[PDB]
Amino acid sequence: TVHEKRKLFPPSADYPDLRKHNNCMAECLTPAIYAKLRDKLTPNGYSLDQCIQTGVDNPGHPFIKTVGMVAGDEESYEVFAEIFDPVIKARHNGYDPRTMKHHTDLDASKITHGQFDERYVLSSRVRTGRSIRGLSLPPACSRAERREVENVVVTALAGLKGDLSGKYYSLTNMSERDQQQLIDDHFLFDKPVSPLLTCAGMARDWPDARGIWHNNDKTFLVWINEEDHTRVISMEKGGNMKRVFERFCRGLKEVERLIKERGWEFMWNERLGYVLTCPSNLGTGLRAGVHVKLPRLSKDPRFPKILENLRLQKRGTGGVDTAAVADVYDISNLDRMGRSEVELVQIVIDGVNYLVDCEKKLEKGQDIKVPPPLPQFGRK
Amino acid sequence: TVHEKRKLFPPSADYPDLRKHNNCMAECLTPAIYAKLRDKLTPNGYSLDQCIQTGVDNPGHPFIKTVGMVAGDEESYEVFAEIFDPVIKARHNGYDPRTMKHHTDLDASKITHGQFDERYVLSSRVRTGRSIRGLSLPPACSRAERREVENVVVTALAGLKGDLSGKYYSLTNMSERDQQQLIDDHFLFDKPVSPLLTCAGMARDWPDARGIWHNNDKTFLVWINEEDHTRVISMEKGGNMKRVFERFCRGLKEVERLIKERGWEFMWNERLGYVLTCPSNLGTGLRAGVHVKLPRLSKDPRFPKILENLRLQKRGTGGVDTAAVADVYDISNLDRMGRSEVELVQIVIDGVNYLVDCEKKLEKGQDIKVPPPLPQFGRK
Amino acid sequence: TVHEKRKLFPPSADYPDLRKHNNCMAECLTPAIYAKLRDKLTPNGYSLDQCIQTGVDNPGHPFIKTVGMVAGDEESYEVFAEIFDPVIKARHNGYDPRTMKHHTDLDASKITHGQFDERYVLSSRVRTGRSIRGLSLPPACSRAERREVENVVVTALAGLKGDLSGKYYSLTNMSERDQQQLIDDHFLFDKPVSPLLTCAGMARDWPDARGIWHNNDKTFLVWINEEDHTRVISMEKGGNMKRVFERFCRGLKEVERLIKERGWEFMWNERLGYVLTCPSNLGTGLRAGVHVKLPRLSKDPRFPKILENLRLQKRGTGGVDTAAVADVYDISNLDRMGRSEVELVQIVIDGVNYLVDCEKKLEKGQDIKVPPPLPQFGRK
Amino acid sequence: TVHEKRKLFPPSADYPDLRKHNNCMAECLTPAIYAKLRDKLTPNGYSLDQCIQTGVDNPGHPFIKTVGMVAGDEESYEVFAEIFDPVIKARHNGYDPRTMKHHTDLDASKITHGQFDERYVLSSRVRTGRSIRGLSLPPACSRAERREVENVVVTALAGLKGDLSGKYYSLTNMSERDQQQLIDDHFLFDKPVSPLLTCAGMARDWPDARGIWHNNDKTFLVWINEEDHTRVISMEKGGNMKRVFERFCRGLKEVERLIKERGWEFMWNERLGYVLTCPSNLGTGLRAGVHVKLPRLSKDPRFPKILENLRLQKRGTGGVDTAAVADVYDISNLDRMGRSEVELVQIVIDGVNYLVDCEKKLEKGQDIKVPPPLPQFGRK
Amino acid sequence: TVHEKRKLFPPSADYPDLRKHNNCMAECLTPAIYAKLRDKLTPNGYSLDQCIQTGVDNPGHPFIKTVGMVAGDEESYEVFAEIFDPVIKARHNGYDPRTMKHHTDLDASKITHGQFDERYVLSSRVRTGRSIRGLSLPPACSRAERREVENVVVTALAGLKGDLSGKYYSLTNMSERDQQQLIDDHFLFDKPVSPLLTCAGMARDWPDARGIWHNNDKTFLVWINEEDHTRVISMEKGGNMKRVFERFCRGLKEVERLIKERGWEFMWNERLGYVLTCPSNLGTGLRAGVHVKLPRLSKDPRFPKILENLRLQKRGTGGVDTAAVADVYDISNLDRMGRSEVELVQIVIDGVNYLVDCEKKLEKGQDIKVPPPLPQFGRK
């Protein structure tokens, strides 16, 4: 097997001081695993030390724990499995890549109906990440590799047509008009600032080879080379979730078609699903969610337990407008690895609908209840 | 010679986009140098790409240019000389490590007199950096290497005695009392924030193996493992510069004595002088300076040209008190590589004295003048 | 183990654009197979890229289905099996080298009704190809290797005696006398022109080390170093197929005897049979056929289905028909890998006899029929 | 450090039979050179055998100088200098890369009489070629390398602006209209047919990554990936040679500017000048010429000797269709390595003007003469 | 490595011409075995070609069993088993080292009644070879290895005491006196002359490190470094075979004791028994035999078949001559590998006794018979 020059000191002399740390990496690393893995390199030379760095640099918090490590390349998940497999099992409470397999399901047809009450649901969004096989992930990828990801994906997207055609904007050389316009649409991103990311080397050479592409009527977003090879997003106003999903699956199948045509594949394997740079997004990499207006259920102290039981999670809107963040919430699927992409989108469909129904109930006085909790895993 | 796995793409495909950059690295890098050096590694494996990263990530500014690269290890200056030698020649306007040699002079005796007017000079300071040979510099050093630097230097310091004895405080485990006390004395530092440093990987594993040591009457400071293996500082209140220097040289000679006793040396070579991690601090690594109160000369529009001619540079005080930063300036030596440590300290002695004399002149009405400019280089 | 520092780009960047291609190679190649195999070399250094080149250079036309790749050496079939095995299974509709074995049977003392009605059967030919083990096939073989093939085979042939003795003509320095004579006999060949062959590098160094050998009464032809190490023809006028075959097997057994005597073997393995440079001629490499005069059955619209059922094919002299009311066809065996050499020759014996009988039938008015179709495979 | 040791036979067993050959390769190869070089590889693995192949396959004809070998990569000229240096010296009658240096000079200001009498001088054009450093030349370059050449050059060209802006047409996907239009303009090329080229492997993977780019008013042509990385052409109607050259130098300087900006250089060295794939096009790669109408001087039997003395050559280029009119001639510079690009263009300016003047003379009866012959080399 | 660029021509080009050969090597070698084994080396570098050389050089004659090959070192039997295993099975008609094991038994007790008619038998002897493990056999052993065999064995013998003590004579400088004395005793040997041996490189550096040792009353002979590391000989006058054997086993056990004491072992393995340099002397290496006077049975034409059935073998006493009768006979055991050392000595005891009894019979007129043939193998 391939070995580090890091043969310099006894590996234990290189052990991190993780005493005050609470992240899944620190929580799962042991003197023995560290010693065993220190000088094992991936084919391209990513090292265990580089995986775990952000987790050593960022002690995190007790209440919200973070993963604490990162994959430089696809082989990282395999070369350093002896530390990734536990971290994954911890982060996706239960799912054990050692023993379980993962089923991908992108047949929108199976979602026969998903329409939300447009009086409460202000908008609907489905995102995921895809990684191009053969090029290193962002913590590691050289400029040339990063450039190639942009080149592969942009050519692919440029061959999309119909409602899925659109244009590409290069962060490196775009006019002030393009800039502001993308700011108003809320399609723009820029250099990461979270030490969780930047301390994992994901902000190198900014903004070289990053860019935004969206279809012409702004319902399909692809972010190239941000915190992952691609983040693909289907979002729409209103609450026609089934249509949002139907396009997500459609653009994802047509993009994969066109990259395979020129010879490239997506990284995917049966025990991890769709390989992405952060362990927390393995499996489906999917976040289906809605902007709900939920003032009554919001104040009820059974909100959290209903949420928890429905396997949904709630976060803030943040960016305001006539969209008064005060009333509005960001309710999305909690799971990522247990279930298929269909299974997860249906979870959001049902859970959100219930949430809406409970808001209605509490408006008409009559009281709601807490539904019996979903299983953490899916079928098959 | 030793080679990178980075054989992946043609090196030119890996060339940085330095179009909007103004730092000495961007200014001096060329397609040919890049191609020639990309896959050359140092003995421990530092790569040209890691040297130049901060300079690629930080476009800098036209008015104040920065160096734009960094040395991971001592061999970096030699392995990648074809890009360091120009950058050095540019930053130390003139000094060409290819053609010139550098003389170190730590004989305080040669400074027969340096007393400042304690009505104007509020305090006097001489700092420099030393790097322990055999362990990688901060951009590169593994935790174990970083730990060893701390271990070598602290043992050394612990054998200092007399007015040079003191104690060591470990950033990783110090009481809130020690903390605040070091804050009041102004001896404390913590995790770098400048992207110039942090994007060069100098903040990894913070605060592991960093610490402050100072002598018992707080006139000799050593910072271990901050932005260099050691930053040694002799500072005193008032203006007895000659005494400040006499101790600086004394502590520096006794420390080198004690590390050589256990088998370690300082990195030093004849064309670069004292090797440190940032090219701008080669040669002497020395900053001798004073906090002057200079209200009259400050307002005179001949201040800058007197400064420039005296080879001094002026910066801000910043941290205030009864020390009202408004009146007070930070006048220090401009050069770093042309001259010896003695030569440079004398430059500050003379230049500051002149500066003080000019302030006096303008108080008594009578007008000052601009002295004829010093040569950029020293003797021998 | 197998690899190559062709690692110059990621392999996918090297994927052929096979979008407008219809050949068995293009039809079966996949981004994954390509990526897996690109940098695997054969013992002598043949590369997957060289195998598939002709197939990349020659897209095709949906009419004629072609193979689209080639074997440089014997190890190619094994090293790049992951693409050869499917291509073989496709070309020899069904035969799967992964799962099946192949039986060779050169015993003419088995073949029965081997005289045709010379009224109708005008000539009888039987050809196959043999490759000398230890030397590279024509797409790859260096001049020295090519020379050695000629040397091994010519010495062997020179020791044939009886009705199997004859002489050898080197294409290199050959009299216009011997040239024209070989043209009249129709024994001559020269530099390939089909881009299928020439783009596979089979015309290099022409005519070095090529030559024709035939027995003294011109019923045994051996072509040395044309589009295969050897191609041995037994052909005779008339229709005594059994005798034609009896000599084919006799010359093939005596040649193999004499090469084994000097230490050389024929390339042969149990899952592929007799290894030759083009996948389509694997197994038996055998083409037993007859020039028949078949004017009646020719016009009948049951000809094709009788042919198909009898497992034969028409390549009538001059395209496949011609501007000829001559009605003389090149009816030959369809299969090449299912069956043994004996099995295949008997297929032609029976099928041709039936064909002749049907012609007779339609002459005497009385109508023919379509025989029940042969199985695609043989015994054992 | 790269060494084939094919060593499947002692190298002499691999010597080509060049007995009936007349090309500069055959003329200069010797048993000893062959044996010395056979198993030496270039960094990327080009072999002497691949260099000389076309020359082995194409004995050529004793009337026309043909070189007989080819360079797979830039290193070929250096690794196999022991056979290239003589071939070059023979080809460019005299110029010896071993002993001489070559001066490039694209200062088109320097030219003077570039305004031919536009009633005989129909056409003016000037073509050179450029090769991108870091990527293999056409005989060798993998699809990925070939793709990269197209990518580097097209981006470069896309940043040309002014009279030098235009558009790019890809052989792979250009419309029926794009096609015929480029045929009428006479900008189109397609798959080489000369065995001199195709037998050197310059037609592989056709038409992948080839394309035509021209400026908007069709006076600057760039052919990408035909028989060289780029073949760049400035041509104009009429006879304003100085202007044609002024743009040639202008486009060549702006293209080199824009590739250097992204990190790529042109292959060039001091003893060979601008490295290109065929030895005959070394030095300047330049071909400045005019379509002249010269009916009188054409019939005079001093034409050839005037031509020879003036260092020009004549051809009649294109197709049967137009060869109807033998009034016109393609008179171009003979040299390619002796002189600089300026020196050579001036040679055509002077020589053509003289040629025109002689035509005039013979019209007015009065007789011409043969000018005293130019030296074969240039200045410096 | 254990692999050579004897990869120079294809191994088949190196195949011996064994057409006119009849030795067990030629009889068993095949193009395939040769090709497979040519470039496999033993740990010390013995090659298949060196094994089989004598057999290529000496065709033999079609009735005498010559092996045709030789082992350079112990590993030869293992590295080149694919040719040795058949040769062994052929030589020792039946015994197959692949499938069978071999039992050694030097317990002379088991030899109970072994006293011959001392009026017919004049002499009795048993010899064997032993090879010292760790040093190469004679075809291969360097002078230093050969020297070491002599040193190990001589020291061992020098520690023999009792009736087994004696002295050692070195051919390198053995005085006139000792020479003739050893000639009269018939203990002397000198440089081999048989091309079977000398063409196997067994006569190199003669007589360096050869020598004779015998016990003081000349009943135990050891020949050092002749055609095997040791040849050990117990011989006595008369016919007390049991005593001859009792000492053979006694000296063999005491010698092995004393070499094991200094750290050396005898080469022995379970499928071949006692490894020696010629395949024919594997197993027991044993030759127990007697000089019989047999004039009557000699003339009887049932002698041969009695011999054959008894597993004996006739050897006309004729190497050293001593006024011999036409009735003195060397009758010895035929087998070497089937049976144990005890089993074989008993075979000679019984068979010779029978032979003697038959001579007696024919003296007293009364007729003998042919005993029913022994099985070719032994027990266990």
XYZ file of C-alpha atoms in Angstrom, chain A residues 127-333:
207
model
C -31.610 20.404 -3.727
C -28.774 17.838 -3.935
C -25.089 17.546 -4.798
C -23.339 15.581 -7.558
C -19.603 14.848 -7.775
C -17.784 14.116 -11.071
C -15.840 10.827 -10.839
C -12.157 11.064 -11.613
C -11.547 14.543 -10.239
C -10.773 15.287 -6.615
C -13.344 16.898 -4.341
C -12.980 20.569 -3.289
C -10.807 20.138 -0.197
C -8.125 18.666 -2.407
C -8.678 19.397 -6.066
C -5.906 21.234 -7.879
C -6.782 24.250 -9.994
C -6.625 22.080 -13.113
C -8.959 19.498 -11.611
C -11.309 22.270 -10.485
C -11.195 23.751 -13.928
C -12.048 20.361 -15.450
C -15.112 19.942 -13.228
C -16.352 23.290 -14.469
C -15.627 22.271 -18.046
C -17.348 18.911 -17.844
C -20.446 20.210 -16.092
C -20.897 23.403 -18.120
C -20.712 21.596 -21.461
C -23.261 19.128 -20.112
C -25.624 21.864 -19.005
C -25.189 23.695 -22.274
C -26.800 20.748 -24.040
C -29.923 20.905 -21.890
C -32.873 22.182 -23.884
C -36.556 22.948 -23.449
C -37.600 24.299 -20.065
C -34.236 23.063 -18.835
C -32.137 25.308 -21.025
C -30.639 28.471 -19.561
C -27.275 30.176 -19.222
C -24.021 30.137 -17.262
C -22.370 33.001 -15.369
C -18.706 32.796 -14.409
C -17.934 34.269 -11.019
C -14.493 35.225 -12.306
C -15.599 37.544 -15.058
C -19.181 38.749 -14.811
C -20.511 42.290 -15.296
C -21.866 44.316 -12.380
C -25.272 43.968 -14.012
C -25.111 40.160 -14.089
C -23.905 40.344 -10.505
C -26.736 42.394 -8.998
C -29.316 40.556 -11.122
C -28.156 37.243 -9.682
C -28.273 38.860 -6.234
C -31.896 39.895 -6.696
C -32.883 36.459 -7.987
C -30.936 35.029 -5.011
C -28.806 32.760 -7.191
C -25.432 34.228 -6.256
C -22.936 32.775 -3.816
C -19.384 33.745 -2.943
C -16.240 32.839 -0.999
C -17.141 30.638 1.984
C -16.521 32.158 5.403
C -17.387 29.377 7.828
C -14.124 28.102 9.336
C -15.716 24.672 8.998
C -15.278 25.007 5.240
C -12.370 27.397 4.819
C -10.250 25.482 7.318
C -10.951 22.412 5.149
C -9.352 24.183 2.206
C -12.543 24.744 0.236
C -11.931 28.399 -0.491
C -8.602 28.115 -2.299
C -8.053 30.038 -5.523
C -11.375 31.905 -5.167
C -13.292 32.517 -7.450
C -11.410 30.559 -10.129
C -13.659 28.107 -11.956
C -16.803 28.788 -9.904
C -20.030 29.893 -11.575
C -23.832 29.861 -11.539
C -26.057 28.337 -14.187
C -29.846 28.513 -14.217
C -32.577 27.689 -16.722
C -34.321 30.526 -18.483
C -37.346 30.782 -16.207
C -35.306 30.427 -13.035
C -36.619 27.129 -11.703
C -33.424 25.073 -12.046
C -30.189 26.232 -10.386
C -26.754 24.578 -10.644
C -23.841 25.944 -8.585
C -20.520 24.850 -9.945
C -17.539 24.316 -7.661
C -18.808 25.965 -4.503
C -18.739 23.503 -1.600
C -19.099 20.503 -3.937
C -18.519 19.658 -7.628
C -22.181 20.543 -8.305
C -25.122 21.572 -6.171
C -28.205 21.044 -8.302
C -31.382 22.788 -7.188
C -34.964 22.695 -8.408
C -37.056 25.371 -6.780
C -40.376 26.986 -7.587
C -42.747 29.458 -6.005
C -45.953 28.145 -4.519
C -46.333 24.556 -3.437
C -46.524 22.288 -6.458
C -43.928 20.008 -4.903
C -44.643 17.180 -7.337
C -43.769 19.394 -10.283
C -40.647 20.713 -8.568
C -39.552 17.109 -8.062
C -40.572 16.042 -11.563
C -38.113 18.567 -12.994
C -35.383 17.847 -10.471
C -35.397 14.218 -11.567
C -35.639 15.277 -15.195
C -32.690 17.623 -15.166
C -30.647 15.181 -13.122
C -31.274 12.381 -15.628
C -30.518 14.513 -18.660
C -27.305 15.904 -17.181
C -26.061 12.439 -16.263
C -26.974 11.404 -19.806
C -24.858 14.110 -21.367
C -21.762 13.617 -19.203
C -21.839 9.866 -19.796
C -21.938 10.727 -23.497
C -18.570 12.450 -23.278
C -17.286 9.758 -20.975
C -17.685 10.971 -17.399
C -19.762 9.452 -14.577
C -21.139 10.637 -11.228
C -19.429 9.205 -8.136
C -21.853 6.755 -6.560
C -21.486 3.509 -4.685
C -23.908 1.062 -3.159
C -23.047 1.477 0.513
C -22.764 5.265 0.507
C -25.027 6.314 -2.332
C -23.986 9.543 -4.023
C -20.472 10.391 -2.825
C -20.051 14.007 -1.742
C -17.355 15.858 0.139
C -19.062 16.111 3.544
C -20.141 12.845 5.257
C -23.415 14.408 6.353
C -24.629 14.591 2.732
C -24.043 10.998 1.654
C -26.800 8.720 0.338
C -29.296 11.072 -1.310
C -27.648 14.398 -0.654
C -31.230 15.576 -0.771
C -32.939 18.519 0.944
C -36.596 18.846 -0.042
C -38.225 21.697 1.816
C -40.808 24.462 1.892
C -41.221 28.016 3.185
C -44.295 27.654 5.393
C -46.222 30.352 7.218
C -47.017 28.691 10.554
C -47.778 31.284 13.281
C -50.129 29.169 15.437
C -48.287 25.839 15.409
C -45.128 27.871 15.880
C -46.269 29.021 19.321
C -47.600 25.611 20.345
C -45.079 23.662 22.471
C -45.904 20.464 20.579
C -44.346 21.846 17.382
C -40.886 20.370 18.134
C -42.169 16.889 18.922
C -44.464 16.860 15.880
C -41.485 17.921 13.794
C -39.261 15.281 15.368
C -41.877 12.589 14.852
C -42.493 13.612 11.254
C -38.727 13.467 10.654
C -38.648 17.105 9.542
C -36.265 19.801 10.724
C -36.937 23.533 11.030
C -34.506 26.352 10.243
C -34.677 30.094 9.593
C -35.530 31.988 6.408
C -33.015 34.784 6.994
C -33.192 36.780 3.770
C -36.314 38.895 4.119
C -38.764 40.878 2.005
C -42.545 41.028 1.804
C -41.398 37.533 2.747
C -41.389 38.493 6.445
C -39.058 35.847 7.915
C -40.928 36.300 11.224
C -43.896 34.223 10.099
C -42.052 31.941 7.699
C -40.085 28.773 8.402
C -37.748 26.450 6.497
C -39.168 22.946 7.026
C -37.126 20.257 5.258
C -36.417 16.532 5.425
